[PDB]
Design a protein around this ligand. Structure first.
Ligand SMILES: COC(=O)[C@@H]1C[C@@H](O)CN1C(=O)c1ccco1
Ligand SMILES: COC(=O)[C@@H]1C[C@@H](O)CN1C(=O)c1ccco1
Lengths: 164, 164
């Protein structure tokens, strides 16, 4: 087996779902595991879908850029929905080399070791309404390289300071 | 023919060249055309390579995020190297929908309609020294989709205001 890749764009071009609707669909259809690497995560709709998935029993692992993590924490506080009290979600932070903050500038979503969304869309209102972006939907062989990269990032991640 | 994809990382993992050395190599080996879509372009080494390519006769088309274009202009002024006086380089800007600036958040390099570098590396010192990032080197069938996306972006681009 090879690798299959479909492109999606924001705004949409020659496909039926927006990128955001495709993210929510990927998450709603997850059976086993969600592995997410994201620079900035403030989009409440996407967060809700991930929380719902975790309540069905899906194991969710989230790696967030350290410098922007406060924005995720602010969003989860506003929502009354602490990741520390959700048993099936683990969140850790990843940073680069400071000099000015070094950042984890990689974004992808990996579901059931089966499908990846890889591209320039960040989970924020601005990507739904303001920015131009594109992603690949990847299935097949190359997915295993994303699994390996998620594990690689996970190994260099830290428990966030906030958490006890 | 299908599509072939190799991953590269910053910092490097199981490959010989850094992403930046691979960018310079792609550019130095271009025979015909370079098509670049970039959010922020301040890296002087990469810029030098693109100028050299244009002086060999390579047609270079650069699409830059509008909101960050001043940073490119500042870099080319510091370098004494105006894109308006280089006959084989065209530069245009692309913007999103403002509300706060909407941005073109897509980055890729497309050389000779043959090879693409697609991923999270921006052409700035910070990506060489501080940030974690990854790209794909793509060849084969999927390259034609990047060609089509470059043309799509180009059609929605503007002459930058500075230029006369
Ligand atoms: C599917 O929803 C949309 O495409 C909306 C509809 C119109 O408001 C344009 N738009 C944008 O999101 C956008 C982002 C960058 C440039 O435009
Ligand atoms: C090939 O050059 C490098 O990898 C340098 C060497 C060491 O200084 C680490 N590094 C980084 O660029 C970096 C970016 C994010 C985290 O580390």
């Amino acid at each position: 087996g090879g690798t299959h890749i479909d492109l999606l764009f924001h705004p949409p071009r020659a496909h039926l779902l927006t990128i955001k609707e495709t993210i929510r669909k990927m998450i709603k259809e997850a059976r086993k595991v969600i592995a997410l690497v994201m620079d900035i995560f403030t989009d409440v709709d996407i967060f809700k879908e991930i929380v719902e998935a975790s309540t069905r029993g899906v194991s969710v692992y989230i790696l967030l850029d350290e410098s922007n993590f406060n924005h995720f924490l602010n969003m989860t506080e506003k929502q009354g929905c602490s990741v520390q009290r959700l048993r099936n979600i683990r969140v850790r932070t990843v940073k680069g080399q400071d000099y000015f903050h070094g950042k984890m500038e990689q974004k992808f979503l990996l579901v059931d070791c089966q499908k990846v969304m890889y591209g320039s869309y960040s989970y924020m209102w601005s990507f739904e309404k303001a920015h131009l972006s594109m992603v690949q939907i990847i299935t097949g062989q190359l997915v295993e390289s994303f699994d390996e990269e998620f594990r690689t990032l996970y190994a260099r991640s830290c428990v966030p300071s906030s958490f006890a």
